Amino acid sequence: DALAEEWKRRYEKEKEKNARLKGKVEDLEKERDFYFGKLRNIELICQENEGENDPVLQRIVDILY
Amino acid sequence: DALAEEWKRRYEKEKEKNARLKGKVEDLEKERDFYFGKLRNIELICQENEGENDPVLQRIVDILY
Ligand SMILES: [Zn+2]
């Protein structure tokens, strides 16, 4: 009766929260992978130019690691 | 009665899910900010060396943007 309706409202409220959290997880994952992909692209650029011995690139490697 | 107990179990289950999603959101946010901070650190390194005209740095700027 009223005790069931009360809990249902709590379930649905918690269920709406779940839906919003699932959407934030998906958005944060895309963002993390996006920035992560850039770091791997830049790491590669640096690895190709290990022969330049550029002290700037070395700074950038330190930040990557 | 039994109808309330059933919904309670659904609320608690959904509530456990919420707790796990909140922890994943916090973990993904830390990771995203971590990688993001590195890109801003590297962007700065590049901006300091705009006078070198290094074509490698230009590659790295393109990846940053
Ligand atoms: Zn040079």
JSON list of C-alpha atoms and ligand atoms in Angstrom, two decimals:
[
{"chain": "A", "resi": 1, "resn": "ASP", "atom": "CA", "xyz": [0.00, 0.00, 0.00]},
{"chain": "A", "resi": 2, "resn": "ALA", "atom": "CA", "xyz": [1.38, 3.39, 1.04]},
{"chain": "A", "resi": 3, "resn": "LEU", "atom": "CA", "xyz": [4.58, 1.71, 2.25]},
{"chain": "A", "resi": 4, "resn": "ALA", "atom": "CA", "xyz": [5.11, 0.16, -1.19]},
{"chain": "A", "resi": 5, "resn": "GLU", "atom": "CA", "xyz": [4.38, 3.43, -3.00]},
{"chain": "A", "resi": 6, "resn": "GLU", "atom": "CA", "xyz": [6.92, 5.20, -0.80]},
{"chain": "A", "resi": 7, "resn": "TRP", "atom": "CA", "xyz": [9.68, 2.72, -1.64]},
{"chain": "A", "resi": 8, "resn": "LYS", "atom": "CA", "xyz": [8.77, 2.79, -5.34]},
{"chain": "A", "resi": 9, "resn": "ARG", "atom": "CA", "xyz": [9.29, 6.56, -5.33]},
{"chain": "A", "resi": 10, "resn": "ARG", "atom": "CA", "xyz": [12.68, 5.95, -3.72]},
{"chain": "A", "resi": 11, "resn": "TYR", "atom": "CA", "xyz": [13.60, 3.31, -6.30]},
{"chain": "A", "resi": 12, "resn": "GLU", "atom": "CA", "xyz": [12.57, 5.51, -9.23]},
{"chain": "A", "resi": 13, "resn": "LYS", "atom": "CA", "xyz": [14.43, 8.51, -7.79]},
{"chain": "A", "resi": 14, "resn": "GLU", "atom": "CA", "xyz": [17.54, 6.38, -7.33]},
{"chain": "A", "resi": 15, "resn": "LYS", "atom": "CA", "xyz": [16.96, 4.98, -10.82]},
{"chain": "A", "resi": 16, "resn": "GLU", "atom": "CA", "xyz": [16.89, 8.47, -12.34]},
{"chain": "A", "resi": 17, "resn": "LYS", "atom": "CA", "xyz": [20.15, 9.19, -10.52]},
{"chain": "A", "resi": 18, "resn": "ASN", "atom": "CA", "xyz": [21.65, 6.03, -12.01]},
{"chain": "A", "resi": 19, "resn": "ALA", "atom": "CA", "xyz": [20.76, 7.16, -15.53]},
{"chain": "A", "resi": 20, "resn": "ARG", "atom": "CA", "xyz": [22.48, 10.51, -14.98]},
{"chain": "A", "resi": 21, "resn": "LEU", "atom": "CA", "xyz": [25.59, 8.86, -13.54]},
{"chain": "A", "resi": 22, "resn": "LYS", "atom": "CA", "xyz": [25.81, 6.44, -16.47]},
{"chain": "A", "resi": 23, "resn": "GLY", "atom": "CA", "xyz": [25.80, 9.42, -18.82]},
{"chain": "A", "resi": 24, "resn": "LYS", "atom": "CA", "xyz": [28.54, 11.18, -16.88]},
{"chain": "A", "resi": 25, "resn": "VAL", "atom": "CA", "xyz": [30.69, 8.03, -16.85]},
{"chain": "A", "resi": 26, "resn": "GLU", "atom": "CA", "xyz": [30.37, 7.78, -20.63]},
{"chain": "A", "resi": 27, "resn": "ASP", "atom": "CA", "xyz": [31.22, 11.47, -21.07]},
{"chain": "A", "resi": 28, "resn": "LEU", "atom": "CA", "xyz": [34.24, 11.32, -18.77]},
{"chain": "A", "resi": 29, "resn": "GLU", "atom": "CA", "xyz": [35.51, 8.17, -20.48]},
{"chain": "A", "resi": 30, "resn": "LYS", "atom": "CA", "xyz": [35.38, 9.80, -23.91]},
{"chain": "A", "resi": 31, "resn": "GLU", "atom": "CA", "xyz": [37.19, 12.86, -22.54]},
{"chain": "A", "resi": 32, "resn": "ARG", "atom": "CA", "xyz": [39.85, 10.78, -20.77]},
{"chain": "A", "resi": 33, "resn": "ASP", "atom": "CA", "xyz": [40.50, 8.67, -23.87]},
{"chain": "A", "resi": 34, "resn": "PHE", "atom": "CA", "xyz": [40.63, 11.86, -25.97]},
{"chain": "A", "resi": 35, "resn": "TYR", "atom": "CA", "xyz": [43.36, 13.47, -23.86]},
{"chain": "A", "resi": 36, "resn": "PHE", "atom": "CA", "xyz": [45.06, 10.09, -23.44]},
{"chain": "A", "resi": 37, "resn": "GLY", "atom": "CA", "xyz": [45.21, 9.56, -27.21]},
{"chain": "A", "resi": 38, "resn": "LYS", "atom": "CA", "xyz": [46.92, 12.93, -27.62]},
{"chain": "A", "resi": 39, "resn": "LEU", "atom": "CA", "xyz": [49.62, 12.04, -25.08]},
{"chain": "A", "resi": 40, "resn": "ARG", "atom": "CA", "xyz": [50.35, 8.79, -26.94]},
{"chain": "A", "resi": 41, "resn": "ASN", "atom": "CA", "xyz": [50.49, 10.65, -30.25]},
{"chain": "A", "resi": 42, "resn": "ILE", "atom": "CA", "xyz": [52.95, 13.15, -28.76]},
{"chain": "A", "resi": 43, "resn": "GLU", "atom": "CA", "xyz": [54.99, 10.41, -27.09]},
{"chain": "A", "resi": 44, "resn": "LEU", "atom": "CA", "xyz": [55.42, 8.85, -30.53]},
{"chain": "A", "resi": 45, "resn": "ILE", "atom": "CA", "xyz": [56.53, 12.18, -32.05]},
{"chain": "A", "resi": 46, "resn": "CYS", "atom": "CA", "xyz": [59.16, 12.41, -29.32]},
{"chain": "A", "resi": 47, "resn": "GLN", "atom": "CA", "xyz": [60.33, 8.82, -29.81]},
{"chain": "A", "resi": 48, "resn": "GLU", "atom": "CA", "xyz": [60.86, 9.47, -33.53]},
{"chain": "A", "resi": 49, "resn": "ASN", "atom": "CA", "xyz": [63.10, 12.45, -32.69]},
{"chain": "A", "resi": 50, "resn": "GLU", "atom": "CA", "xyz": [65.27, 10.83, -30.02]},
{"chain": "A", "resi": 51, "resn": "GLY", "atom": "CA", "xyz": [68.17, 11.50, -32.41]},
{"chain": "A", "resi": 52, "resn": "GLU", "atom": "CA", "xyz": [67.65, 15.27, -32.34]},
{"chain": "A", "resi": 53, "resn": "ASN", "atom": "CA", "xyz": [68.58, 15.30, -28.63]},
{"chain": "A", "resi": 54, "resn": "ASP", "atom": "CA", "xyz": [66.37, 18.38, -28.29]},
{"chain": "A", "resi": 55, "resn": "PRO", "atom": "CA", "xyz": [66.31, 19.44, -24.61]},
{"chain": "A", "resi": 56, "resn": "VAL", "atom": "CA", "xyz": [62.78, 20.73, -25.22]},
{"chain": "A", "resi": 57, "resn": "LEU", "atom": "CA", "xyz": [61.58, 17.27, -26.25]},
{"chain": "A", "resi": 58, "resn": "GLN", "atom": "CA", "xyz": [63.24, 15.88, -23.13]},
{"chain": "A", "resi": 59, "resn": "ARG", "atom": "CA", "xyz": [61.16, 18.26, -21.02]},
{"chain": "A", "resi": 60, "resn": "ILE", "atom": "CA", "xyz": [58.10, 16.97, -22.87]},
{"chain": "A", "resi": 61, "resn": "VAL", "atom": "CA", "xyz": [59.10, 13.34, -22.28]},
{"chain": "A", "resi": 62, "resn": "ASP", "atom": "CA", "xyz": [59.41, 14.05, -18.55]},
{"chain": "A", "resi": 63, "resn": "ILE", "atom": "CA", "xyz": [55.87, 15.45, -18.54]},
{"chain": "A", "resi": 64, "resn": "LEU", "atom": "CA", "xyz": [54.66, 12.37, -20.43]},
{"chain": "A", "resi": 65, "resn": "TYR", "atom": "CA", "xyz": [56.25, 10.07, -17.85]},
{"chain": "B", "resi": 1, "resn": "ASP", "atom": "CA", "xyz": [3.94, -6.06, 2.97]},
{"chain": "B", "resi": 2, "resn": "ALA", "atom": "CA", "xyz": [5.54, -8.29, 0.34]},
{"chain": "B", "resi": 3, "resn": "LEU", "atom": "CA", "xyz": [4.99, -5.58, -2.28]},
{"chain": "B", "resi": 4, "resn": "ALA", "atom": "CA", "xyz": [6.92, -3.07, -0.15]},
{"chain": "B", "resi": 5, "resn": "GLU", "atom": "CA", "xyz": [9.75, -5.52, 0.54]},
{"chain": "B", "resi": 6, "resn": "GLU", "atom": "CA", "xyz": [10.07, -6.18, -3.19]},
{"chain": "B", "resi": 7, "resn": "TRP", "atom": "CA", "xyz": [10.44, -2.49, -4.02]},
{"chain": "B", "resi": 8, "resn": "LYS", "atom": "CA", "xyz": [12.87, -1.97, -1.13]},
{"chain": "B", "resi": 9, "resn": "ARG", "atom": "CA", "xyz": [15.11, -4.66, -2.60]},
{"chain": "B", "resi": 10, "resn": "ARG", "atom": "CA", "xyz": [14.91, -2.81, -5.92]},
{"chain": "B", "resi": 11, "resn": "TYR", "atom": "CA", "xyz": [15.76, 0.51, -4.28]},
{"chain": "B", "resi": 12, "resn": "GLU", "atom": "CA", "xyz": [18.72, -0.94, -2.39]},
{"chain": "B", "resi": 13, "resn": "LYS", "atom": "CA", "xyz": [20.01, -2.71, -5.50]},
{"chain": "B", "resi": 14, "resn": "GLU", "atom": "CA", "xyz": [19.74, 0.52, -7.48]},
{"chain": "B", "resi": 15, "resn": "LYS", "atom": "CA", "xyz": [21.35, 2.33, -4.53]},
{"chain": "B", "resi": 16, "resn": "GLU", "atom": "CA", "xyz": [24.34, -0.03, -4.57]},
{"chain": "B", "resi": 17, "resn": "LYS", "atom": "CA", "xyz": [24.66, 0.64, -8.30]},
{"chain": "B", "resi": 18, "resn": "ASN", "atom": "CA", "xyz": [24.64, 4.39, -7.60]},
{"chain": "B", "resi": 19, "resn": "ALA", "atom": "CA", "xyz": [27.52, 4.02, -5.14]},
{"chain": "B", "resi": 20, "resn": "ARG", "atom": "CA", "xyz": [29.60, 2.15, -7.72]},
{"chain": "B", "resi": 21, "resn": "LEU", "atom": "CA", "xyz": [28.86, 4.72, -10.43]},
{"chain": "B", "resi": 22, "resn": "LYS", "atom": "CA", "xyz": [29.81, 7.60, -8.12]},
{"chain": "B", "resi": 23, "resn": "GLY", "atom": "CA", "xyz": [33.17, 5.92, -7.55]},
{"chain": "B", "resi": 24, "resn": "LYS", "atom": "CA", "xyz": [33.76, 5.45, -11.27]},
{"chain": "B", "resi": 25, "resn": "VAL", "atom": "CA", "xyz": [32.87, 9.10, -11.97]},
{"chain": "B", "resi": 26, "resn": "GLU", "atom": "CA", "xyz": [35.42, 10.21, -9.38]},
{"chain": "B", "resi": 27, "resn": "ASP", "atom": "CA", "xyz": [38.08, 7.89, -10.81]},
{"chain": "B", "resi": 28, "resn": "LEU", "atom": "CA", "xyz": [37.48, 8.97, -14.41]},
{"chain": "B", "resi": 29, "resn": "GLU", "atom": "CA", "xyz": [37.54, 12.65, -13.41]},
{"chain": "B", "resi": 30, "resn": "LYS", "atom": "CA", "xyz": [40.93, 12.28, -11.71]},
{"chain": "B", "resi": 31, "resn": "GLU", "atom": "CA", "xyz": [42.27, 10.45, -14.77]},
{"chain": "B", "resi": 32, "resn": "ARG", "atom": "CA", "xyz": [40.87, 13.02, -17.21]},
{"chain": "B", "resi": 33, "resn": "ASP", "atom": "CA", "xyz": [42.30, 15.93, -15.21]},
{"chain": "B", "resi": 34, "resn": "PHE", "atom": "CA", "xyz": [45.63, 14.10, -14.96]},
{"chain": "B", "resi": 35, "resn": "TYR", "atom": "CA", "xyz": [46.01, 13.69, -18.73]},
{"chain": "B", "resi": 36, "resn": "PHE", "atom": "CA", "xyz": [44.54, 17.16, -19.27]},
{"chain": "B", "resi": 37, "resn": "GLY", "atom": "CA", "xyz": [47.11, 18.75, -16.96]},
{"chain": "B", "resi": 38, "resn": "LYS", "atom": "CA", "xyz": [49.91, 17.13, -18.95]},
{"chain": "B", "resi": 39, "resn": "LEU", "atom": "CA", "xyz": [48.60, 18.56, -22.23]},
{"chain": "B", "resi": 40, "resn": "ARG", "atom": "CA", "xyz": [48.51, 22.06, -20.71]},
{"chain": "B", "resi": 41, "resn": "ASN", "atom": "CA", "xyz": [52.04, 21.63, -19.35]},
{"chain": "B", "resi": 42, "resn": "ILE", "atom": "CA", "xyz": [53.25, 20.55, -22.80]},
{"chain": "B", "resi": 43, "resn": "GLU", "atom": "CA", "xyz": [51.32, 23.34, -24.53]},
{"chain": "B", "resi": 44, "resn": "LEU", "atom": "CA", "xyz": [53.21, 25.80, -22.33]},
{"chain": "B", "resi": 45, "resn": "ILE", "atom": "CA", "xyz": [56.57, 24.21, -23.19]},
{"chain": "B", "resi": 46, "resn": "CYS", "atom": "CA", "xyz": [55.70, 24.67, -26.87]},
{"chain": "B", "resi": 47, "resn": "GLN", "atom": "CA", "xyz": [54.58, 28.27, -26.40]},
{"chain": "B", "resi": 48, "resn": "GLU", "atom": "CA", "xyz": [57.90, 29.12, -24.74]},
{"chain": "B", "resi": 49, "resn": "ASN", "atom": "CA", "xyz": [59.78, 27.75, -27.77]},
{"chain": "B", "resi": 50, "resn": "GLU", "atom": "CA", "xyz": [57.77, 29.43, -30.53]},
{"chain": "B", "resi": 51, "resn": "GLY", "atom": "CA", "xyz": [61.05, 31.15, -31.44]},
{"chain": "B", "resi": 52, "resn": "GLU", "atom": "CA", "xyz": [62.83, 27.88, -32.17]},
{"chain": "B", "resi": 53, "resn": "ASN", "atom": "CA", "xyz": [60.46, 27.28, -35.11]},
{"chain": "B", "resi": 54, "resn": "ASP", "atom": "CA", "xyz": [61.01, 23.56, -34.57]},
{"chain": "B", "resi": 55, "resn": "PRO", "atom": "CA", "xyz": [58.82, 21.63, -37.06]},
{"chain": "B", "resi": 56, "resn": "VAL", "atom": "CA", "xyz": [58.59, 18.87, -34.44]},
{"chain": "B", "resi": 57, "resn": "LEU", "atom": "CA", "xyz": [57.01, 21.25, -31.92]},
{"chain": "B", "resi": 58, "resn": "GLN", "atom": "CA", "xyz": [54.59, 22.35, -34.64]},
{"chain": "B", "resi": 59, "resn": "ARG", "atom": "CA", "xyz": [53.49, 18.73, -35.05]},
{"chain": "B", "resi": 60, "resn": "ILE", "atom": "CA", "xyz": [52.96, 18.63, -31.29]},
{"chain": "B", "resi": 61, "resn": "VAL", "atom": "CA", "xyz": [50.95, 21.87, -31.34]},
{"chain": "B", "resi": 62, "resn": "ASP", "atom": "CA", "xyz": [48.69, 20.40, -34.03]},
{"chain": "B", "resi": 63, "resn": "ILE", "atom": "CA", "xyz": [48.04, 17.37, -31.81]},
{"chain": "B", "resi": 64, "resn": "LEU", "atom": "CA", "xyz": [47.31, 19.69, -28.88]},
{"chain": "B", "resi": 65, "resn": "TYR", "atom": "CA", "xyz": [44.76, 21.62, -30.95]},
{"chain": "C", "resi": 1, "resn": "ZN", "atom": "ZN", "xyz": [66.92, 22.23, -33.15]}
]
